[PDB]
């Protein structure tokens, strides 16, 4: 059973007898720290953390004892405190007498904002605030997931309205194949899940049960797959029977979308002889419901889609849209799933308009560009005390490196607002209780061991929206 | 509760609608696919088929969940009810699969089958790439094993030339990384596969892992010691860092303790908080309670340098045997701000270049050590290599025509020693003409039993580095 008194960093064991004797307040908070592009964050995934491991009574007898027994062979000194934690399972019953105030989920934030703040409630648990900070900082995980996918929907957005003239099909173009790519199960329905907050489309299945249990939707499900095809199922047929297996594949899935990976042993000849001239009446009978969707996998990917697309061009009727741009008949899309992160998909979209082809042509299946190729760094999510209370009197505290003032943290309490122009700013030093700026925007979401507010995954959706499709 | 029906990709579902008719065998292995970092450490896969895949993983409650779940998200009736029904009716719901593979802890060139998954009854001839998705996560402690071990070796090569000895190796790279990785079950096996190599961890979820899965004869796999971080620096207020140090190194007086020194200014922290104000309670200190200062900001190599100059003309400075210059023993440096493989690297070339011991100094590593990883790192791979339909057997492989690097490889597959001792894999069954002695793969999993399993100790073991042994 998880246990948290064993889920922090080592050292933190061991600052209960650091801070300033007669300290009864301990206050931080988290931001994207801004840097000397990402302009902008999606906050996505604290619900999750509150939920599976800090509310309730998290404290028992026996984790108590558990974590001494561990702290004492990884320390080879007896330093937890365990007094600390008794008197949180004695008064509170277990429960952490702390309150984290947070941004709405799916709230679109410029980058050196507050997004959340935390403190304890009770003077004993001073100490507490920080212990819990690991478990926490961890959020920046479906934070940068839904950032970055978020990033890539906006470049998909451009160029669809600029090669069709309108977003439909938008939030299917970026599918998550991240699955196997990403380092565990929790991650993976972590990481799905905020995927999940910018587009429908996915393959990683653990997204849909995370959703439903700590987020809910109206919709019996959040995100939609199609059958399609692996290497395996077209390689067992053997080398000399590609089109065999091409033809099985489609004929069992003649009446919904089926993709089709075509590059086995060579995506051209695939595309040109066997689906463009020997598999081709089963190619042009589909419906505009249930297209081929042929896949390469190999290759530089910009050359190869705009190969493909060249090949698939000459084999079936083109149109040309009314912006310009060439169209495939709808019985037939491409997607590529190699390769692909947010510099690699602006390269294909820029690449395939200036050869004037449609981006209603292409989607893009996504894995570890998507789940796993991303740091705590990107968005510089951190997290820093800025308030204390000793001997009564509250401090504002902060880190200022003299080397390095993007490591410079705000000042004491902080609250999040609107601006006169719509913008949002952080007040630093309890400036927001002047009460100048209207009204704070980060409300209590966790107090004394209660979730006390909670946000469904509609709602998170609703906030993410791009402006473009506001627009 | 974890749904193994519900752990694979989407599309898998409708794969056994998709192979041949009438096969009755899938046979598939896994690779770090050959196209720096030429061998690897095989770590993970017990962890999952102990959490994941043994025992009874499939009953009517799972197999309806599934049911559901997959009418929605297709929208249409694709799920293989049947097939799983079979499994649990059958084999009381334990996978008929049987995995083959090398040991864990082994070090083995790219390019080498690792392991490799086939079904053990006909029925199920889907199920051996059902869990591709599963097994495939395994990439991700084999990375984090193999980087951490590259790092290793590193570390050892500038040590044994500045100090002439390995003493202290096994401490020198520290994971700091259990908030920067993605998820709490990540912390735990990315912490526990860099527990291969080093002792020293903050990511406590890698304890509790070890001791469940695999097992020490030491009460723990990994140690750690106090410190400060910024809050309980700063909390003290900006005009009393030197106060917060005093306690701190106070409190922990008689063992060792490591102090963020870099709040406000590093350099003055150093030359004249630490150097002047407080010297003497650092020079009274025991050789097996030193401070042990931590820079955290600027750049790493040009910073680490000058923390060692300035605290080389306020300490007694000796020369080591090698003629390197060593601080005394009650006082070190850990640079964890900016470490990966690369800046590790260029932090102990610049120290040599000024003739500093490596001694000197540690390595705390987060993000570069657990999180900056990807499966793409040692082209970590999942193919089928033969399937039997009809009764015949056939050797498959995709070769695409654009990228030779993706080719896999073809037939039944077993793993060897050379006749100079090194490894190769045999493919298309060659194994069976007893030209290379037997297979080293051993068999690990057999119809829902875990067969084989390591203990931590001796992966550890399989693990070390030549210069080590
Ligand atoms: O093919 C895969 N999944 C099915 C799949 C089919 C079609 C689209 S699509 O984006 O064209 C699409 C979406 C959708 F929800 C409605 C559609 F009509 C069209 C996406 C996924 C696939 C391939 C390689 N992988 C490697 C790791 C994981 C995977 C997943
Ligand atoms: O300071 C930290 N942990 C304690 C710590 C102290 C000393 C060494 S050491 O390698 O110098 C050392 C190891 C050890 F096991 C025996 C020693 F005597 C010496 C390592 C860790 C720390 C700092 C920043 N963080 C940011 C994220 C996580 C952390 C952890």
């Known amino acids: 059973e998880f246990n948290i008194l064993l889920a922090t960093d080592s050292y933190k064991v061991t600052h209960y007898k650091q801070y300033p004797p007669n300290t009864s307040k301990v206050y931080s908070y988290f931001e994207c720290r801004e840097k000397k592009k990402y302009e902008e964050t999606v906050f996505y995934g604290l619900q999750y953390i509150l939920n599976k491991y800090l509310k309730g009574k998290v404290v028992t007898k026996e984790k108590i004892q558990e974590a001494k027994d561990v702290y004492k062979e990884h320390f080879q000194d007896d330093v937890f405190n365990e007094k600390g934690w008794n008197y949180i399972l004695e008064k509170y019953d277990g429960h952490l007498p702390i309150e984290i105030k947070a941004v709405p989920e799916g709230f679109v934030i410029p980058r050196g904002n507050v997004l959340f703040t935390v403190e304890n409630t009770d003077p004993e648990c001073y100490w507490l605030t920080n212990w819990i ?5 961890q959020s920046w995980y479906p934070i940068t997931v839904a950032t970055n996918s978020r990033e890539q929907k906006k470049i998909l957005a451009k160029y669809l309205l600029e090669t069709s003239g309108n977003l439909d099909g938008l939030e299917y173009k970026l599918h998550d194949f991240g699955y196997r790519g990403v380092s565990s199960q929790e991650t993976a329905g972590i ?5 999940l907050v910018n587009f429908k489309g996915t393959d990683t299945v653990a ?15 959040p995100g939609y797959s199609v059958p399609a095809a692996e ?8 080398k000399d029977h590609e089109k065999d297996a091409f033809e099985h594949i489609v004929t069992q899935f003649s009446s919904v979308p089926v993709s089709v990976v075509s ?16 598999l081709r009446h089963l190619i042009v009978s589909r419906s505009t419901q249930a297209p081929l969707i042929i896949r390469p996998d190999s ?40 390769g692909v992160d947010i510099n690699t998909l602006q390269e294909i979209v820029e690449g395939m308009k200036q050869k004037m ?12 560009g998507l789940l796993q190729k991303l740091t705590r760094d990107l968005l510089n999510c951190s997290f820093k005390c800025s308030y204390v209370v000793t001997n009564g009197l509250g401090i ?26 719509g913008n949002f700013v952080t007040l630093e030093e309890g400036k927001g209780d002047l009460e100048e700026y209207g009204q704070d925007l980060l409300h209590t979401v966790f107090k004394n061991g209660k979730v006390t507010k909670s946000y469904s995954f509609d709602e998170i959706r609703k906030n993410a929206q791009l402006n473009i499709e506001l627009e």
């Open 299 to 338: 290759g530089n990917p910009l050359d190869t889609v705009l190969k493909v697309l060249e090949i698939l061009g000459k084999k079936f009727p083109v149109t040309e849209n009314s912006k310009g741009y060439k169209l495939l008949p709808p019985y037939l899309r491409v997607i590529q799933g190699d």
């Open 357 to 368: 082809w449609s981006i209603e042509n292409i989607a893009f299946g996504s894995g570890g």
């Open 396 to 421: 504002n505290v902060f880190k200022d490196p003299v080397a390095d003032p993007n490591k410079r943290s705000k000042k004491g309490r902080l609250s999040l607002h609107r601006t006169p122009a």
């Open 191 to 195: 990481g799905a899940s905020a995927h």
């Open 133 to 137: 900070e690991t478990i926490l900082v």
């Open 231 to 238: 290497h395996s199922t077209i390689t067992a047929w053997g």
């Open 263 to 278: 590059d086995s042993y060579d995506i051209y000849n695939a595309c040109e002889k066997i689906w463009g001239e020997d």
């Open 207 to 221: 997204g849909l049960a995370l959703i439903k249990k700590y987020y809910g939707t109206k919709d019996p499900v």
